[PDB]
């Protein structure tokens, strides 16, 4: 089942500053009281990240190029964002990856799905309209659920050697509109063996029915670039500060 949403209000996408966010652990290695220089796909400091809104009438669910990695920031309350759409052509011709978090668990599937042009979920105050068919499945994985704006959700998605790395961090914030300025290293959550080509992605939202109403949420998309970071490890082994080696001569 698919439904065209024709009550949207036209608005250009926003942009904002990344500050010092998007840092994640490059590996599964504990380090104590040491500075480690690493070369990997990292998010540049103070970069221009694309800002999308969900407010009422804004409902931002486009398809964006994946590039070499995706940093997803979510200023979320009441759990509007439920999952993601990963693929190349987003149809039954190729094989696509589905990440969903419903009311019980998280489901990760690599199958040939027929995606709708406008995919969404719905809460009645009972509506699933994200696909119409699923033909050839190769990988299924059912796990425990990961989940004023009250919650901040950071995610890093990487496609390296046929391995899909999902890094995540939950942060309690109380800032009304923009991203807070601070440091929070993202722990690795799950590595999925997929071995598939992914070049495009799309966020999945949920409708509110009482037509339709969009719940208040905001999210940010940043792009990962190959660079060097100098990470500081404390006595307890958490990354407390980082240096971007290609940002400015002082950090160089």
């Amino acid at each position: 089942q698919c439904v065209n949403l024709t009550t949207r209000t036209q608005l250009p996408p926003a942009y904002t500053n990344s500050f010092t966010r998007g840092v994640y652990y490059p590996d599964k290695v504990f380090r104590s009281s040491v500075l480690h220089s690493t070369q990997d796909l990292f998010l540049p400091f103070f970069s221009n990240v694309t800002w999308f809104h969900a407010i009422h009438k804004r409902f931002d669910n486009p398809v964006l190029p994946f590039n070499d990695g995706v940093y997803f920031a979510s200023t979320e309350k009441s759990n509007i964002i439920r999952g993601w759409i990963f693929g190349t052509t987003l149809d039954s011709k190729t094989q696509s990856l589905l990440i969903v978090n419903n009311a019980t668990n998280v489901v990760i599937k690599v199958c040939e799905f027929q995606f709708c042009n406008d995919p969404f979920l719905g809460v009645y105050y009972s509506e699933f309209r994200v696909y119409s068919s699923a033909n050839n499945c190769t990988f299924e994985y059912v796990s425990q659920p990961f989940l004023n704006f009250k919650n901040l959700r950071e995610f890093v998605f990487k496609n390296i050697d046929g391995y899909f790395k999902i890094y995540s961090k939950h942060t309690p914030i109380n800032l009304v509109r923009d991203l807070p300025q601070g440091f929070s290293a993202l722990e690795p959550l799950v590595d999925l063996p997929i071995g598939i080509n992914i070049t495009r992605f799309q966020t999945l939202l949920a409708l509110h029915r009482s037509g339709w109403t969009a719940g208040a949420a905001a999210y940010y998309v940043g792009y990962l670039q190959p660079r060097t970071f100098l990470l500081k490890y404390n006595e307890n082994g958490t990354i407390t500060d980082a240096v971007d080696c290609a940002l400015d001569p002082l950090s160089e």
Partner: protein
């Protein structure tokens, strides 16, 4: 000391002659308690395989793997392993295994190798040059040949460009071999991309069916899920042991740690990028790997004109790990420690000196 100095007369002094090295007592192997056996029966003993243009890939992970049943079998004609020793397949641990099963003919089995050419290598199945894994090929004349011809096995014969490694092409588009747009209809200079093998039991071994399973092991900076059936021994700590933690081989004195690893953090590294702590695969316990008490063996002697008595200094070695006296420099054997203070005759270090009067320190 005479052997080291290449002289028969040793002058009074201290001479570094050898290198003490604590040797490991026993071997400890700790693996996760996974007992479900890896599905190699579905890979190798399937009723029907697939054609080489549509070669079948199977993901093996999260199971204990037994490679002894593959090696001892007397049907596998080709067991060519690249990057790994075929006998040492049982020893190592990996994270993910990719099983590519297909059926080819005999003369083109040699094309399934890194760096060769041919129709299978160019248009059907290409192996990367950095391939780490094995190729297992066996004759299947009884199962894949029929009297009158078995034409259900096809190979891609025509393609515009050569394939990428680990890429498949199941498309059926009519290959134009001339300059005529013929609209996807077979005829003059328009050929079907797929051509049948046509296997018969009377055909020669160059044109006989061979089933090929290509096992690809990938080993990243990830926790290993595919391991051998090596048994996990009991945890013996505070002793110099050879150890194998989830494929992480080494030698050390494993003790109890106070480090707080995060749940994803398996092992640990120090400031000098050496592995100094691991998580126990079974009980999820952090164990510090201190290494072995290596030391310099120095011989303290007066002149051979005076006496033949010697003392041995093990530098930086505690006396419980080797007239025995403990110094900050190390363990000194053969010198009687006295409470009196004299001038330094033979320097030992850390305020310790030796002299002859017997040898005193």
């Amino acid at each position: 000391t005479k052997c080291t100095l290449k002289s028969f007369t040793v002058e009074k002094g201290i001479y570094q002659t050898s290198n003490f090295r604590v040797q490991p007592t026993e071997s400890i192997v700790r693996f996760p308690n996974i007992t479900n056996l890896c599905p190699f029966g579905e890979v190798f003993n399937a009723t029907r395989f697939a054609s080489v243009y549509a070669w079948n890939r199977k993901r093996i992970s999260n199971c204990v793997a037994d490679y002894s049943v593959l090696y001892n079998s007397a049907s596998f004609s080709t067991f060519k392993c690249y990057g790994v020793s075929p006998t040492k397949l049982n020893d190592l641990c990996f994270t993910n295994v990719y099983a590519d099963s297909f059926v080819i003919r005999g003369d083109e089995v040699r094309q399934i190798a890194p760096g060769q050419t041919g129709k299978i290598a160019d248009y059907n199945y290409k192996l990367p040059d950095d391939f780490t894994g094995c190729v297992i090929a066996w004759n299947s004349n009884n199962l894949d040949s029929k009297v009158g011809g078995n034409y259900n096995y096809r190979y891609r014969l025509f393609r515009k460009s050569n394939l990428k490694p680990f890429e498949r092409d199941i498309s059926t588009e009519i290959y134009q071999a001339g300059s005529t747009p013929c609209n996807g209809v077979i005829g003059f200079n328009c050929y079907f991309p797929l051509q049948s093998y046509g296997f018969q039991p009377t055909n020669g071994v160059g044109y006989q069916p061979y089933r090929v399973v290509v096992l690809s092991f990938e080993l990243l900076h990830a926790p290993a899920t595919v391991c051998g059936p090596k048994k996990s021994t009991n945890l013996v700590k505070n002793k110099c042991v050879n150890f194998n933690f989830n494929g992480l081989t080494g030698t050390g004195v494993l003790t109890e740690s106070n480090k707080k690893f995060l749940p994803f953090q398996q092992f640990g590294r120090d400031i000098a990028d050496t592995t100094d702590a691991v998580r126990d695969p079974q009980t999820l316990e952090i164990l510090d790997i201190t290494p072995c008490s290596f030391g310099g063996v120095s011989v303290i002697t007066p002149g051979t004109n005076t006496s033949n008595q010697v003392a041995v200094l093990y530098q930086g070695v505690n006396c419980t790990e080797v007239n025995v006296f403990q110094t900050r420099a190390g363990c000194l054997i053969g010198a009687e420690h006295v409470n009196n203070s004299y001038e330094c005759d033979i320097p030992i270090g850390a305020g310790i000196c030796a002299s002859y009067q017997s040898i005193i320190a």
